[PDB]
XYZ file of C-alpha atoms in Angstrom:
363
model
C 2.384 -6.951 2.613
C 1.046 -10.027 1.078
C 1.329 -10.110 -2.988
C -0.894 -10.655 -5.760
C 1.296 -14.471 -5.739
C 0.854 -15.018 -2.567
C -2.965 -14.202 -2.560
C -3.758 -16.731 -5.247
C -2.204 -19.105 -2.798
C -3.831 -18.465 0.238
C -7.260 -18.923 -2.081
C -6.529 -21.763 -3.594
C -5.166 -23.356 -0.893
C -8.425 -22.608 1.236
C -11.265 -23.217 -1.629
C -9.770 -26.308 -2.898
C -9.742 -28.343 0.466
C -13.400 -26.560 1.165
C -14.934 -27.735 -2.087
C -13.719 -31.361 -1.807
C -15.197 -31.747 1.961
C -18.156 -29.597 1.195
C -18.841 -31.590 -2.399
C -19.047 -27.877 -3.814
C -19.289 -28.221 -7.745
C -17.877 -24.378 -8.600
C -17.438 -21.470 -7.026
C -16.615 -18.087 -7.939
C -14.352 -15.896 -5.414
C -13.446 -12.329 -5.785
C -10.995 -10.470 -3.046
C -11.144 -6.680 -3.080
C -7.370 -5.829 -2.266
C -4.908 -3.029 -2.911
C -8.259 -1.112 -4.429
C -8.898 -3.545 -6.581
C -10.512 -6.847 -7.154
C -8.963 -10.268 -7.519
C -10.733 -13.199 -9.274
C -10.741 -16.573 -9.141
C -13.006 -19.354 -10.311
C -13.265 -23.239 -9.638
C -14.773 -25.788 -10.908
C -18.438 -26.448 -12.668
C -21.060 -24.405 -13.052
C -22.936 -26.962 -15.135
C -21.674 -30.525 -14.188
C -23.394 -32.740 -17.357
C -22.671 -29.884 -19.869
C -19.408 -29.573 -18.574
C -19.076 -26.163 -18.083
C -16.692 -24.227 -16.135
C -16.963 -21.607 -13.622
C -16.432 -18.148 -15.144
C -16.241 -14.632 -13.728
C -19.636 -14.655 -15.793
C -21.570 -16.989 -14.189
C -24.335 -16.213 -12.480
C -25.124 -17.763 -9.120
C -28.368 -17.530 -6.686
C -27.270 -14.475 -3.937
C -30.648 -15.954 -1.991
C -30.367 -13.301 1.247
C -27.549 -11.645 0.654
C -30.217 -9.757 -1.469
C -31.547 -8.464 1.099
C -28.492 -6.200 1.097
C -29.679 -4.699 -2.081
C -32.976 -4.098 -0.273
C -30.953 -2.591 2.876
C -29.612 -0.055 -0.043
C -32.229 0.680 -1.848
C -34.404 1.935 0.983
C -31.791 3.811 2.714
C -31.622 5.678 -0.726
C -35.276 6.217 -0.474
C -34.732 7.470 2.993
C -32.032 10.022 1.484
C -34.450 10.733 -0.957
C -37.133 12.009 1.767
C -39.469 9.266 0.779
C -39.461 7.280 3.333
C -38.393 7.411 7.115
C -37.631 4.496 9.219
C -39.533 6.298 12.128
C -42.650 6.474 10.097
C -45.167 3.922 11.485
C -45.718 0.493 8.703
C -49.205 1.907 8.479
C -48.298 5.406 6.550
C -47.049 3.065 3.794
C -50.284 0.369 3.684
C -52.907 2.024 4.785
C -54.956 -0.987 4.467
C -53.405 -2.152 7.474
C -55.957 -1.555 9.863
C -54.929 -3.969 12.739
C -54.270 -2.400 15.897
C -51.694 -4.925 16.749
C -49.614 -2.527 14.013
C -49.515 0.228 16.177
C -46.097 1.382 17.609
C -44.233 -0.972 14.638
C -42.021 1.205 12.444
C -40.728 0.631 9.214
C -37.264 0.540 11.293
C -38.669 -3.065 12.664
C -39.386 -4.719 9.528
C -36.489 -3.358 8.191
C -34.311 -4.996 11.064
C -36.864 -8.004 11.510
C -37.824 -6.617 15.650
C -41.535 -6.470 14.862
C -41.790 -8.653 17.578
C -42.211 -12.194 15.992
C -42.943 -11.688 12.082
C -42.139 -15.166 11.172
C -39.329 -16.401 8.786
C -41.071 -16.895 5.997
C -44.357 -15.593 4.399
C -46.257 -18.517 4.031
C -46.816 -20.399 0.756
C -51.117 -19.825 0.790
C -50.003 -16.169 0.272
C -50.669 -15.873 -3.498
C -52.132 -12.687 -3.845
C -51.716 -8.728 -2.177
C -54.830 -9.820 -0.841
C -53.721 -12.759 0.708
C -50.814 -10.836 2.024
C -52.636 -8.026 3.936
C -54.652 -10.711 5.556
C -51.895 -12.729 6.574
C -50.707 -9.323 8.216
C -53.660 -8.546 9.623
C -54.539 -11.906 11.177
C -50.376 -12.143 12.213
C -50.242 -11.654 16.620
C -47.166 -10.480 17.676
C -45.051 -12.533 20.483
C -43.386 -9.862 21.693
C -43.951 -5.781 21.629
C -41.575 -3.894 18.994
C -38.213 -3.398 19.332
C -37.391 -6.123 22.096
C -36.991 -9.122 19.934
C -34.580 -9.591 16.570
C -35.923 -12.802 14.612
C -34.475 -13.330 11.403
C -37.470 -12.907 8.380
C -37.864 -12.689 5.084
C -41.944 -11.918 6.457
C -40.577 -8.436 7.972
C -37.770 -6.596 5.482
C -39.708 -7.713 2.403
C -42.035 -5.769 3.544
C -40.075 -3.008 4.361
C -38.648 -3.246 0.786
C -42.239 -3.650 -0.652
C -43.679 -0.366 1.108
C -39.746 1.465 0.801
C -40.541 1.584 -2.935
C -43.832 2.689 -2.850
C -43.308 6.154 -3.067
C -41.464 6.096 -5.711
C -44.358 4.755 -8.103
C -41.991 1.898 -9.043
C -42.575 -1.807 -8.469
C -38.970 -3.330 -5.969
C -37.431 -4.972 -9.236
C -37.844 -1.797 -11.539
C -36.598 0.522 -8.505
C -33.800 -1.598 -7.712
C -32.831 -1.313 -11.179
C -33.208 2.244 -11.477
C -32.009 3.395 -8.780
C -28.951 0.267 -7.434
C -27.895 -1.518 -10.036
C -27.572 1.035 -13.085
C -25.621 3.535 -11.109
C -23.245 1.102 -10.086
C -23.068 -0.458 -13.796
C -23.890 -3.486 -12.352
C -25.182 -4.722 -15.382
C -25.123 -8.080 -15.167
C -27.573 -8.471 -12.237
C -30.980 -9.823 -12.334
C -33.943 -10.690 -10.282
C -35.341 -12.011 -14.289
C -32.430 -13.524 -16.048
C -33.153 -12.169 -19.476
C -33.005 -15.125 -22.518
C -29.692 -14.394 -23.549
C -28.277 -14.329 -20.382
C -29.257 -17.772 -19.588
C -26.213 -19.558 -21.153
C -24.171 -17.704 -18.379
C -26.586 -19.286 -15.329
C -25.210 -21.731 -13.286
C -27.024 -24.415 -12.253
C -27.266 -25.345 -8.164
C -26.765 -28.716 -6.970
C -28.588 -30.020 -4.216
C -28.087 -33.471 -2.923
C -26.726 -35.191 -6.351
C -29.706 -33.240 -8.114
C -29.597 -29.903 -10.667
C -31.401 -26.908 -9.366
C -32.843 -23.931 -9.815
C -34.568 -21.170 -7.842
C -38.567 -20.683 -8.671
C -40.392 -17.645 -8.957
C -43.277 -17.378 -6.546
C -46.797 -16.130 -6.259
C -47.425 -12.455 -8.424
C -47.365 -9.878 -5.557
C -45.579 -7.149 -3.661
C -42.621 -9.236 -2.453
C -42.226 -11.613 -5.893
C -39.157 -9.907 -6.898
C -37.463 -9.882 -3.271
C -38.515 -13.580 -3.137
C -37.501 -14.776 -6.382
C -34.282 -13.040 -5.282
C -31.096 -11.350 -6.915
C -28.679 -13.315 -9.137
C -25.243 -12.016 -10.635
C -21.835 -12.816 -11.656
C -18.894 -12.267 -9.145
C -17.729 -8.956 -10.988
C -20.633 -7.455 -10.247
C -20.657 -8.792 -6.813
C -17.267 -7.507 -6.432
C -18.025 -4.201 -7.480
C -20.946 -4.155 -5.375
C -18.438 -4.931 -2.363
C -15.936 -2.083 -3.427
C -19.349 0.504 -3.218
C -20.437 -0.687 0.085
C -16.790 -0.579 1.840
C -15.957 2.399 0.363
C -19.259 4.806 -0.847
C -17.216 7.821 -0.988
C -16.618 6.332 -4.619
C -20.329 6.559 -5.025
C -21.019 9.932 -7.006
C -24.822 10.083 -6.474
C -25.626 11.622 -3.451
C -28.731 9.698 -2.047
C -27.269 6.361 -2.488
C -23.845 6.971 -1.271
C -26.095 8.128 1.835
C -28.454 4.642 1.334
C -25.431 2.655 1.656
C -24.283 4.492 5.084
C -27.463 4.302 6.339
C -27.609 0.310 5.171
C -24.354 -0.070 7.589
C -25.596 1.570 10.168
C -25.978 0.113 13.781
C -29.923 0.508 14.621
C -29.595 -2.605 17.464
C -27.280 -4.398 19.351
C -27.345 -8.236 20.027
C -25.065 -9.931 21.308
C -21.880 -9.398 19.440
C -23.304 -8.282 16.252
C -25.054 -5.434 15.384
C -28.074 -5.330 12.947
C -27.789 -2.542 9.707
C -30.553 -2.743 7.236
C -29.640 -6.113 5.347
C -26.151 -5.807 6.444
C -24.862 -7.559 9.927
C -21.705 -6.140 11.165
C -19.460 -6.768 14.774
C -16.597 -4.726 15.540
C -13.377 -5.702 14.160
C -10.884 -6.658 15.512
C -13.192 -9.943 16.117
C -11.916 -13.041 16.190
C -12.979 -16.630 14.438
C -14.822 -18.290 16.594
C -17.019 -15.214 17.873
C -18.178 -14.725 13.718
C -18.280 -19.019 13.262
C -20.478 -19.402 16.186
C -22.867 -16.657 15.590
C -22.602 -17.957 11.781
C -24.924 -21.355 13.298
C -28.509 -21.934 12.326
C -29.769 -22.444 16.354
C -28.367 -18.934 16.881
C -28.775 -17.234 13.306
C -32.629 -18.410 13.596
C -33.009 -17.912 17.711
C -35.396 -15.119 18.472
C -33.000 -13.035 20.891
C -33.141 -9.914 22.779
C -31.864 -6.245 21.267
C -30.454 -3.200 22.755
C -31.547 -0.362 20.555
C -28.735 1.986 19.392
C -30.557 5.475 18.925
C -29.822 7.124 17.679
C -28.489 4.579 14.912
C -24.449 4.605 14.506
C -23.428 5.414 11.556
C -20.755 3.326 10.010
C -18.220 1.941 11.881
C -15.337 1.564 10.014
C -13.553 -0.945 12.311
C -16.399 -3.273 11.411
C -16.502 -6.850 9.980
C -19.427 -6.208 7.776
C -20.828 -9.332 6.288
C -24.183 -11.448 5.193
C -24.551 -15.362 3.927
C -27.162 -16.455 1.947
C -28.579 -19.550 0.500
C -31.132 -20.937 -1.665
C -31.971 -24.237 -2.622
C -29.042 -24.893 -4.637
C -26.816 -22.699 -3.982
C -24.312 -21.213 -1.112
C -22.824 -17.748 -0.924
C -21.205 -15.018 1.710
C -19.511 -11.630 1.452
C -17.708 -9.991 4.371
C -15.677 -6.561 4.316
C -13.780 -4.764 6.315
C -14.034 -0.867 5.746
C -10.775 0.081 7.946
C -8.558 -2.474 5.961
C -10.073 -2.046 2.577
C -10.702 -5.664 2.166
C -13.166 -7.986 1.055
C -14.298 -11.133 0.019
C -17.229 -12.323 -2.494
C -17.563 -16.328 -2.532
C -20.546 -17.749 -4.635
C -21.176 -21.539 -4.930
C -23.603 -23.334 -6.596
C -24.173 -25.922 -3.366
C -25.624 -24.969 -0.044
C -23.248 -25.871 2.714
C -23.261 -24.627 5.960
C -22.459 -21.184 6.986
C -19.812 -21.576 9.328
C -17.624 -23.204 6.686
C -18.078 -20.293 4.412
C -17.253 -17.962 7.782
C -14.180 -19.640 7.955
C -12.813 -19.769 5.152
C -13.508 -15.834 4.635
C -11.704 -15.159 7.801
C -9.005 -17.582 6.952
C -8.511 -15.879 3.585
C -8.936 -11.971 5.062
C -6.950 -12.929 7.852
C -3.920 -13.520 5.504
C -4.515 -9.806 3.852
C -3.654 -7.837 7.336
């Protein structure tokens, strides 16, 4: 077995090349090993203050978010609030469209709608802005045929997956996530005197920061989730191993959040979470890892009923914002992880392979 010396190699020796050819300012990496996490930081987090990368910086998640979204409403599903069977409509009644029919929270959880587009679109400023742009929205193809990657379909599901609840996404996600798992330094808001601990992003030569959007249903999910790799970590030791998880419907959220509902290709789609069967090799994760594929509307094969977790999986998400680049991947068998967060955006498939490269070295 690989030591705790020989780990700090294999990292270094792997983010050091990676943030000279990828002009990566700092990044935070945490590797869940031996039951325990292992951290190590690079670098800047503010280049003209001159300040270093801690295990206390925060850094932009941008979708890997959406894994906190996949969480929180499988816990509302364990809670009997919700049902991913339940038609869209039993949540937003307002949603008259017929076009709706047959489209279950299920789809926009796991973006096969059938064509919600990637983004909701920027004259959306308003709830009632929103339900028009639903309403008027014509579907390409019927539900559950087509798997296009949107931040239009599971913010909504995490919009209506709350509703019962009475709470607004941020405050549920709070309540309900983040507390339990004393991940207390996580944020959609950074509060004021958390800010000295926020990186900044760098984009192009340029310092920069994630906006907050239009008031509305999805602001929190858009604005997304920042943190500090500890609490990543943490939040990668819950999801590869819930039976740590004492409360009983979010230990059941997380399973259901790693759950196979469809099939594509070689990956699977969970509810934020992406997983493929492990063993798997590089090139199979690298390749899918490319925008003309990640992006590419593609046919599904619908696992029902949905698989519970498999834990020969490579379970894993990327995510990106403006100014910032970051990717988790686990592997539930092996007990191992990986957490890297980096305050530049550059491209996926070198953040694939330098998780694999690193994880590879662990088995």
């Amino acid at each position: 077995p690989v030591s705790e010396k020989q780990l700090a190699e294999v990292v270094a020796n792997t983010v050091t090349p990676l943030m000279k050819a990828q002009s990566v300012p700092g990044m935070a990496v945490a590797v869940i090993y031996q039951g325990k996490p292992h951290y190590y930081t690079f670098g800047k987090a503010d280049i003209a203050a001159n300040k270093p990368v801690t295990p206390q910086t925060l850094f932009e998640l941008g979708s890997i978010s959406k894994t906190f979204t996949g969480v929180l409403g499988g816990d509302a599903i364990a809670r009997g609030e919700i049902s991913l069977d339940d038609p869209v409509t039993r949540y937003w009644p307002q949603l008259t469209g017929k076009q709706w029919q047959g489209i279950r929270m299920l789809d926009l959880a796991t973006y096969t709608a059938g064509g919600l587009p990637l983004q909701v679109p920027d004259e959306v400023t308003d709830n009632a802005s929103l339900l028009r742009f639903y309403q008027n929205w014509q579907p390409q193809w019927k539900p559950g045929t087509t798997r296009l990657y949107a931040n239009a379909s599971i913010g909504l599901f995490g919009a209506l997956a709350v509703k019962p609840s009475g709470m607004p996404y941020e405050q549920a996600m709070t309540t309900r996530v983040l507390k339990p798992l004393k991940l207390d330094h996580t944020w959609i808001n950074v509060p004021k005197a958390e800010e000295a601990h926020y990186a900044w992003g760098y984009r192009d030569g340029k310092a920069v920061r994630a906006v907050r959007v239009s008031p509305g249903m999805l602001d929190a999910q858009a604005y997304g989730v920042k943190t500090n790799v500890q609490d990543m970590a943490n939040w990668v030791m819950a999801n590869m191993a819930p039976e740590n998880v004492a409360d009983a419907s979010l230990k059941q959220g997380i399973a259901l959040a790693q759950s196979r509902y469809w099939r594509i290709g070689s990956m699977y789609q969970g509810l934020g979470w992406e997983m493929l069967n492990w063993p798997v090799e590089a090139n199979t994760v690298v390749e899918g890892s490319d925008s003309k594929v990640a992006l590419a509307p593609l046919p599904v094969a619908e696992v029902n009923p949905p698989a519970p977790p498999v834990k020969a999986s490579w379970v894993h998400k990327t995510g990106s914002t403006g100014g910032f680049g970051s990717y988790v991947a686990f592997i539930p068998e092996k007990q191992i992880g990986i957490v890297m967060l980096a305050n530049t955006s550059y491209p996926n498939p070198a953040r694939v392979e330098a998780a694999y490269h690193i994880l590879e070295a662990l088995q």
